[PDB]
């Protein structure tokens, strides 16, 4: 009935393909998982070389064929949008869930029963996390740097996770404002080669990659009066063109950022009036500058008045790696800040720029929702234990899926230890026993010691949202996947 | 899962390919390294023949495939942008670092341990260089010519490194201004065949490749009044066109550089008023002329006034290799100078022009940061010794990588001696022993004597930045490379 070119999978072949497809992704990314995990090199169709460990980035760059692997990516993308972290980690346990789920179908457990088991175990797993979830100060310096640093680790940049934590915690806490929701757009991620990662620095203002449009304009302005015009300073005839500049002067403005171009005659008039200016300014930069200086974005040059001017304590042209850039700093009430990332190579400042973007994310997560959980696999051990107990309370056929769900959550502690160079068997014997007795804040694996320790006391913590959202999205995707027995794909 | 055409390397094959890729580049360029090193001929897709020894130039011209070789180039490009020199040298030791690093991975030393070892050794290597770093006068004539000359050597032009050092040290020191940052754009590199390399000469003013637009205009102007107009001298009707010229005259201007064209009628009016002029002037030349004469760049011809005129003591049309060029010299306060490179062939003045560009770079480096180090491999011997000692203080597994790092730094002294025609074994036995006892300023290899000598006393020194930045960028790239275990490249 169907047209030649349309393809179809069904029954165990559809389910086998679907489980294998998701498994392949999970097995691919789990190699970057953990402090002792490795990195990946993603090279595009032009030769552009990217260095990362992020599962999502890897999945966005790779071109997938199988729908099952595409759905696992959709989970990874939601995990990115919703939390930012837990990306790589969530994918791995999802593959395991599917790996084991197939056996349950092979054991003649109806897919709706496996779904019921995973649905039940995940609903209890959320309450379990909320039960052990540790409430902390939303703006607490210490825990904010503990979240920040643990997120930073496993990267070449971790050597400076202390400086990076201080930079991100400082920038974020300020731009949070109310209690609360933080906008990452208020923290600009700028990268310029030169110096090292410890030299990365936060400027409470806006750094733009612009220069002084005229040699005759000042290179430094104190108590700067910033004007923001999106209309090009270009007028037929010198009298009308001069009028434009005369209004900027008359308004008291002496720094001028034009979103569009500036006629060379206008650049002359600007330089004549002692007005320093830059043309072809990015709309985003026009916005950050308004938010920093408190300048009012003006459309028509004629409309610009003194009341529209923004304030900056210092506007100065400085060279970074030779490139001329403008620092707009010491503004009255800047709502925007700029983090300048330093490093010895383009790829170093590239990956660091990615690392600190995430650091902002996870710090913002902790401030927005003041609940965190103990890391080092301690939570996953809690869940395995209590879900094994719950499985007995569940009974019927569903217990088998609930039992397997709890076991599947162990693949993460297992992969961490494997990559750490530890025997997952000996680890789990000591960690699981030590966890059950000592508790949740007195457990997990310290891969740097090679033994069970106190992850919470060691500052090894992650935002609650990481663990809870990971379970929600991952569980629903694998339950859905199991429901499909027949896929029809047009070419 | 991945599309047909996408390629992938993983595990030891990825790491083997990556180490081999970087090694190939290092082995290719190291043949130009040293006073007794050879030159390379780079020929483009049209047949254009380039003669150079510069690793960066070679790497920019060559078309690389492997990402690993591309990352080593990124180091070489940062080395160029940041320091200018140390290009070829930095690449070589980087290849060795990777060559040895592979064995450590083969010896089951986790890549993070090798990274820790290199990270530790490089951090100590910086302090070691800062410990032996010699502070010198930022504008000291003598050491500026010593830096200059040592950079010049290994080139056919070294026969005149004394004249070249004097030329570059003179030009740079002036355009430095404050303490300080030097702009290389204030020293123009002009090349015109004829004479020899000893005939290369600096003119404290601006030399442009322009001629007298009219046969009726003067070929020599004394106490010249220079006008700089970017608007073409072309007006509908003779009265309006004449007005333009009448304003130039009225302003007192008698030399006229127009960025755009000049109507033949205007050229007549200009010649009639005794005004000498050149049209179609390059924007860069309009800028250098403003900086030299102190002329104010005027947009509208009508706007030109007497106060906008720049001063030149002498503006004269002279022929070099037959070509008519204008010398604008003896200006009041010229901020720009021009170095005219002479030589017996196009390729001679080409490579010399490259050699003196670098000479400006390295002299500027010494003035900007008044720290230098002893050359002839003395530093690298210092580092090998102290890092071998530190390795013992490091202990654990990391010592193995620190030990190998210190040894890898020796490949440079080794390659210099090989190309010098010396037995690196006998050299290192005498140099290393003589260095450890006599010190840092009483060592290194004199490849011209064929024995250990005093490189510092012999004037064989290089800027600190050369050695320190080389370690920073190179160490980070090789540490990153080691971290990647899996590369996926789209076609």
**Residue to test with chain A: of B116, B300, B488, most A Cβ within 10 A:** B488
Minimum CA–CA partner of A351 in chain B: B480
Half-sphere exposure of B362 (CA within 13 A, CB side): 31
Distance CA A93, CA A78 (A): 16
Q: Please tell me whether residue A150 adopts helix, strand or coil conformation.
A: helix
Q: Which residues pair with B10 in a beta bridge?
A: B486
Which of B111, B119, B489 minimises the CB distance to A159? Answer: B119
- In terms of CA atoms, which chain A residue is nearest residue B477? A345
Q: Are A65 and B3 in contact (CB under 8 A)?
A: yes
CA angle A402, A404, A406 (to 5 degrees): 70
* Interatomic CA distance for residues B12 and B105, integer angstroms: 9
CB neighbour list of residue B46: distance below 8 Å, 6 or more residues apart: none
B294: left (phi over 0), alpha (psi -120 to 50) or beta: left
Q: How many angstroms away from the CA of B292 is the closest CA of chain A? A: 13
Cβ distance B311 to B226 under 8 Å?
Answer: yes
Nearest CA to B111 out of B487, B484, B482, B404 is that of: B482
In sequence order, what are the beta bridge partners of A225? A311
Nearest to A330 by CA among A223, A174, A218, A170: A223
Please state at what angle helix B67-82 crosses helix B87-106, rounded to 10 degrees. 140
Backbone angles phi, psi at B41, to 5 degrees: -115, 110
Distance (Å, whole) CA A89 – CA A373: 15
CA distance B228 to B285: 10
By C-alpha distance, which of B114, B479, B82, B109 is closest to A342? B82
Q: Are B182 and B172 in contact (CB under 8 A)?
A: yes
Q: B87, B150, B293, B379: which one is catalytic?
A: B87
Say if residue A437 is exposed, middle or buried (CB neighbours under 10 Å; 0-12, 13-18, 19+): exposed
- Beta-carbon count within 10 A of A28 CB: 23
Q: Are B486 and A49 inside 8 Å of each other by CB?
A: no
Angle at B456 between CA B408 and CA B390, to 5 degrees: 35
A44 touches chain B (CB under 8 A): yes
Q: Which of chain A's residues have a Cβ under 8 Å away from the Cβ of B477?
A: 344-345, 347
What six digits make up the tokens of B480? Answer: 């990153």
- Give, in degrees to the nearest 5, the angle at Cα B298 between B294 and B304: 95
* Cβ-Cβ contacts under 8 Å for B121 (sequence gap 6 or more): B387, B390, B391, B401, B402, B405, B406
Nearest to A197, CA basis, from A7, A340, A379: A340
Instruction: Name A435's Cβ contacts closer than 8 Å, sequence gap at least 6.
Output: A378, A381, A382, A385, A443, A444, A452
Dig out the tokens for A30 from the structure. Answer: 């789990």
Q: Is B488's CB within 8 Å of A62's CB?
A: yes
Say if the Cβ atoms of B78 and A43 lie within 8 Å. no
Query: Which of B299, B473, B491 has the CB atom closest to A344's CB atom?
Result: B473
Residue B43 CB coordination number (10 Å): 10
CB atoms within 10 A of CB B425: 9
Helix (H) or strand (E) holding A336: none
For the beta carbon of residue A114, count every other beta carbon within 10 angstroms: 29
Backbone angles phi, psi at B469, to 5 degrees: -70, -35
Taking only residues 285 to 324 of chain B, the set having a beta carbon closer than 8 angstroms to any beta carbon of chain A reads: 287, 290-291, 296-300, 302-303
DSSP per residue, A258-271: ESS-B-HHHHHHHH
Buried b (16+ CB within 10 A) or exposed e, B298-322: bbebebbeeebbbbbbebbbeebee
- Beta-carbon contacts below 8 Å between A and B: 122
Q: What's the burial of B121, exposed, middle or buried (CB within 10 Å: 0-12/13-18/19+)?
A: buried
Tokens (6 digits) for A405: 């769900």
Angle of helix B464-483 versus helix B11-29 axis, rounded to 10: 160
Question: How far apart are the CA of A38 and the nearest CA of chain B, in angstroms?
Answer: 6
> What DSSP character marks residue A296?
P
| Chain B contact present for A50, CB below 8 A | no
A126/A468 Cα distance (integer angstroms): 6
Nearest to A228 by CA among A257, A270, A251, A254: A257
Distance from CA of B372 to the nearest CA of A (A): 18
* Whether B368 contacts chain A with CB within 8 A: no
Q: Does A215 touch chain B (CB under 8 A)?
A: yes
Q: Taking a contact as any Cβ pair under 8 Å apart, which residues of chain A between 141 and 160 contact chain B?
A: 156, 159
Residue from A31, A38, A65, A217 to probe the interface with B (highest B Cβ count within 10 Å): A38
Rounded CA gap, A94 and A469, in Å? 13
Separation between Cα atoms, residue A98 and residue A401, nearest integer Å: 11
Question: What span, in angstroms and rounded, lies between the C-alpha atoms of A371 and A379?
Answer: 14
A345: nearest CB among B3, B78, B110:
B78
Q: CA-to-CA distance for A463 and A371, rounded, in angstroms? A: 6
Distance CA A424, CA A417 (A): 5
Q: CB of B12 within 8 Å of any CB in chain A?
A: no
Tell which residue, A191, A185, A188, A205, has the closest CA to residue A255: A205
Sign of the CA dihedral running B211, B213, B216, B217? negative
What lies within 8 Å, CB to CB, of B181 at 6+ separation is: A319, B368
Tokens for B290, please give them: 């403003």
A27 touches chain B (CB under 8 A): no
Q: Which member of B1, B75, B490 has the closest CB to residue A45?
A: B490
HSE-up (13 A, CA, CB side) for residue B405 = 32
Rounded distance, CA A427 to CA A452, Å? Answer: 7
Residue in the block written with tokens 């003395």: B378
CA atoms within 13 A on the CB side of A298: 28
A225, with CB counted inside 10 A (0-12, 13-18, 19+), is: buried
Distance in angstroms (rounded) separating the CA atoms of residues B55 and A349? 24
- Phi, psi dihedrals of residue A325, rounded to the nearest 5°: -135, 155
Distance in angstroms (rounded) separating the CA atoms of residues B208 and B277:
13
A61 and B CB contact within 8 Å: yes
Tokens representing residue A269 in the block: 């008039």
Which chain A residues in 250-269 lie under 8 Å from chain B, judged by CB atoms?
Answer: 263-265, 267-268
Entry field: residues in chain A: 491
Q: Which of A227, A210, A223, A221 minimizes the C-alpha distance to A310?
A: A227
B1, B181, B489: residue with CB nearest A66: B1
- Dist CA B200 CA B203 (whole Å): 10
The 3-class SS string of chain B reads: CCCECEEEEEHHHHHHHHHHHHHHHHHHHCCCCCCCCCCEEEECCCCCEEEECCHHHHHHHCCCCCHHHHHHHHHHHHHHHHCCCCHHHHHHHHHHHHHHHHHHHHCCCCHHHHHHHHHHHHHHHHHHHHHHCEECCCCCHHHHHHHHHHHHCCCHHHHHHHHHHHHHHHHHHHHHCCCCCCCHHHEEEEECCECCHHHCEEECEEEECCCCCCCCCCCEEEEEEEEEECCCECCCCHHHHHHHHHHHHHHCCCEEEECCCECHHHHHHHHHCCCEEECCCCHHHHHHHHHHHCCCCECCHHHCCHHHCEEEEEEEEEEECCEEEEEEECCCCCCCEEEEECECCHHHHHHHHHHHHHHHHHHHHHHHCCEEEECCCHHHHHHHHHHHHHHHHHCCCHHHHHHHHHHHCCHHHHHHHHHHCCCHHHHHHHHHHHHHHHCCCCCCEECCCCEECCCCCCCCEEEHHHHHHHHHHHHHHHHHHHHEEEEEECC
Alpha carbons A63 and A45: distance in angstroms, whole number: 12
Q: β-strand A7-10 against A486-489: which pairing, if any? A: antiparallel
- Residue A45 to residue B491, Cβ atoms within 8 A: yes
Of B290, B298, B483, the CB nearest to A156: B483
| Nearest alpha-carbon partner for B291 in B253, B326, B328, B317 | B328
Scanning the structure block, which residue is given the tokens 């709502």? A335
A positions 102-131 inside 8 Å of B (CB): none
Scanning every residue of chain B, which has its alpha carbon at the shortest distance from the alpha carbon of A194? B82
The neighbour count for residue A316, using CB atoms within 10 Å, is 17
- Which tokens go with A461? 């913590």
Tokens of B122: 């490089």
Report yes or no: A98 and A478 within 8 Å, Cβ to Cβ.
Answer: yes
Rg (CA), chain B: 28
For residue A21, the surrounding DSSP H or E stretch is helix A11-29
Gap between the Cα atoms of A440 and A384, Å rounded: 12
Q: Which of B2, B75, B300 sits opposite A63 (nearest CB)?
A: B2
Q: Exposed (0-12), middle (13-18) or buried (19+): which is B189, by Cβ within 10 Å? A: middle
Identify whether the C-beta of residue A28 lies closer than 8 Å to the C-beta of residue A96.
no
For the CA atoms of B286, B289, B291, B295, the dihedral, rounded to the nearest 10 degrees, stands at -90
Task: In whole angstroms, give the CA distance from residue A337 to residue A205.
Answer: 5
Cβ distance B488 to A41 less than 8 Å, yes or no, reads yes
Considering only CB atoms, A264 lies closest to which of B67, B299, B489, namely: B299
CB contact under 8 A, B300 and A61: no
Tokens of A452: 């069970």
Say yes or no for a CB contact (<8 Å) between A421 and B81.
no
- Tokens linked to B227: 């006008």
CB-nearest to B111 from A38, A64, A321 is A38
Q: Are B369 and B423 in contact (CB under 8 A)?
A: no
Residue B251 C-alpha, separation from nearest chain A C-alpha, in angstroms: 18
Which residues of B are less than 8 Å from A156 in CB distance? Answer: 115, 476, 479-480, 483
Instruction: Name the token pair of A281.
Output: 């300014």
Long-range contact list for B383-390, CB < 8 A, 24+ apart?
B383/B125, B383/B128, B383/B129, B383/B409, B384/B409, B384/B410, B384/B432, B385/B432, B385/B435, B385/B436, B386/B124, B386/B128, B387/B121, B387/B124, B387/B125, B387/B128, B390/B120, B390/B121, B390/B124
- Write out the two tokens for A224: 């700067």
Say yes or no for a CB contact (<8 Å) between B490 and A344: no
Whether the Cβ atoms of residue A477 and residue A68 lie closer than 8 Å to each other = no
Can you give the length of chain B in residues? 491
Indicate the SS3 state at residue A120: helix
Residue A220 in contact with partner chain B when CB distance is under 8 A: no
Q: Collapse the DSSP code of A310 into the 3-class scheme (helix H, G, I; strand E, B; otherwise coil) and give the result.
A: strand
Q: B144: which residues sit within 8 A by CB, 6+ positions away?
A: B165, B169, B172, B173, B363, B366, B367
CB-neighbour burial class of residue A73 (10 A; exposed 0-12, middle 13-18, buried 19+) = buried
Q: What single-letter DSSP state applies at residue A187?
A: E
The neighbouring-strand residues paired with A52 are A40
In this structure, are residues B41 and B447 in contact, taking their beta carbons and an 8 Å threshold?
A: no
Contact A49, A41 (CB under 8 A): yes
- Do A41 and B491 lie within an 8 Å CB cutoff? no
Burial class (CB in 10 A: 0-12, 13-18, 19+), A2: exposed
Burial B133-154 (b: 16+ CB within 10 A, else e): beebebbbeebbbbbbbbbbeb
**Distance (Å, whole) CA B294 – CA B232:** 21
Q: Write the CB contacts of B50 (distance below 8 Å, at least 6 apart in sequence).
A: B41, B42, B43, B44, B57, B61, B350
A65 touches chain B (CB under 8 A): yes
Judged by a CB distance cut-off of 8 A, whether residue A45 touches chain B is yes
Active site residue B236: no
CB B295 within 8 A of CB B289: yes
Nearest to A354 by CA among A26, A75, A100, A85: A85
Distance CA B219, CA B201 (A): 22
Nearest Cα neighbor of A97 from A118, A119, A68 is A118
Sign of CA pseudo-dihedral B2, A156, A344, B373: negative
SS3 for A35? coil
How far does Cα B167 stand from its chain's mean position?
16
Q: Which of B118, B314, B285 is nearest to B219 (CA)?
A: B314
Q: Answer yes or no: do A322 and B70 touch at CB < 8 A.
A: no
Q: What is the DSSP code (8-state) at residue A298? A: B
**DSSP designation for A456:** T
DSSP letter (8 states) at residue A273:
T
d(CA B116, CA A188): 31
Catalytic site includes residue B358: yes
CB-based contact B298 A345, cutoff 8 Å: no
Residue among B84, B489, B491 with most chain A CBs within 10 A, to mutate: B489
């Amino acid at each position: 009935v169907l047209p030649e070119n349309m393809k179809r999978y069904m029954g165990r072949d559809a389910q086998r393909m679907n489980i294998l497809a998701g498994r392949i992704i999970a097995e691919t990314v789990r190699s970057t998982l953990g402090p002792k995990g490795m990195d990946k090199m993603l090279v595009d169709d032009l030769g552009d070389v990217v260095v990362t460990n992020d599962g999502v980035t890897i999945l966005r760059e790779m071109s997938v064929e199988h729908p099952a692997a595409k759905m696992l990516i959709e989970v990874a993308k939601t995990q990115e949008k919703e939390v930012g972290d837990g990306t790589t980690t969530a994918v791995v346990v999802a593959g395991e869930l599917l790996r084991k789920a197939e056996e349950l179908l092979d054991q003649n457990v109806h897919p709706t029963i496996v779904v019921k088991g995973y649905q039940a175990a995940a609903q209890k797993a959320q309450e379990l996390l909320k039960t052990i979830a540790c409430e902390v100060g939303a703006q607490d310096k210490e825990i904010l740097t503990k979240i920040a640093m643990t997120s930073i680790t496993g990267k070449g940049a971790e050597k400076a996770k202390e400086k990076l934590a201080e930079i991100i915690v400082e920038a974020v806490s300020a731009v949070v404002d109310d209690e609360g929701k933080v906008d990452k757009d208020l923290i600009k991620i700028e990268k310029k080669s030169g110096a090292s990662i410890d030299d990365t620095e936060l400027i409470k203002g806006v750094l733009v990659d612009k220069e002084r449009v005229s040699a005759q304009m000042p290179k430094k302005v104190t108590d700067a009066k910033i004007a923001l015009l999106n209309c090009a300073i270009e007028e037929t005839a010198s009298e009308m063109l001069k009028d434009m500049v005369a209004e900027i002067k008359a308004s008291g403005a002496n720094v001028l950022f034009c979103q569009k171009g500036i006629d060379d005659l206008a650049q002359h008039y600007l330089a004549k009036e002692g007005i320093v200016a830059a043309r072809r300014v990015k709309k985003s930069d026009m916005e950050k500058l308004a938010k920093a200086t408190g300048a009012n974005v003006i459309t028509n040059i004629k409309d610009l008045s003194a009341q529209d001017l923004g304030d900056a304590g210092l506007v100065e042209e400085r060279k970074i790696s030779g490139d001329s850039m403008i620092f707009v700093e010491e503004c009255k009430h800047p709502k925007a800040v700029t983090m300048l990332i330093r490093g010895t190579t383009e790829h170093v400042i590239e990956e660091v720029a990615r690392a600190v973007d995430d650091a902002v994310g996870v710090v913002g997560c902790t401030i927005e929702d003041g609940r965190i959980v103990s890391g080092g696999g301690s939570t996953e051990v809690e869940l395995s234990m209590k879900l094994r107990e719950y499985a007995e309370g569940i009974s019927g056929r569903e217990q088998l899926a609930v039992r397997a769900f709890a076991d599947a959550l162990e693949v993460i502690p297992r992969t961490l230890a494997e990559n750490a160079g530890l025997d997952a068997i000996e680890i789990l014997v000591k960690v699981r026993a030590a966890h059950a007795s000592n508790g949740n804040k007195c457990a997990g694996l310290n891969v740097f010691t090679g033994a069970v320790e106190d992850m919470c006391e060691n500052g090894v913590v992650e935002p609650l949202r990481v663990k809870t959202q990971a379970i929600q999205s991952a569980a629903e995707s694998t339950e859905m996947l199991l429901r499909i027995d027949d896929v029809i794909a047009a070419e």
